[PDB]
Amino acid sequence: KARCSRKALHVNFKDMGWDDWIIAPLEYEAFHCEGLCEFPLRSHLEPTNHAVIQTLMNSMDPESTPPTCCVPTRLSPISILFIDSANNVVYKQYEDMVVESCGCR
C-alpha cells in the first residue's frame, strides 16, 4: 500500500455509447487518484488546513475520525467536438477532465 498518487484511467467514449454524439476525441487519458493518506501529508502543493487537521486527528486517535481520502487537487480541460441537441457541431472546452495532481482531503 503506497501513499496518495496518480494512476492511469483510460476513458473510452465508445465503451459508454457516447460516440453517437461525440465526434472527436473518442478516448483520452483522464488519470485518477489512489493511495494511503497518512502523516505527514507529502505533496508538491500545500494541503488545505482542514485536511491537515483531519489527518493529524486520525494520526492521534484513529478510532475517532476517519482518514482523509486521495482525490484530484488540480485538473486540466480537454476539447471535445460533438453534436448538440440542435444538430449543430460544437467545439467545447470541457473543464476538470484530466487529473494533474492528487492530494489528501
Partner: protein, 52 residues
Amino acid sequence: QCKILRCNAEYCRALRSYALCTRRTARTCRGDLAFHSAVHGIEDLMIQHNCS
C-alpha cells in the same frame, strides 16, 4: 440552465420518473456530460434486474 441535478433528488417507477424528468429538462442541456451520464445510468438500471 441545465437542470439535470433536480432529477437526482426524488430518486421501476422511480426509473420512469427519472426518465420523464430528464426528458423535461433535455432542452437547456445541449451538451452536458451529467445529462448523458444520467441517461446511461437510467438505461443501465432499467436493464438490470427486471424492469420495462
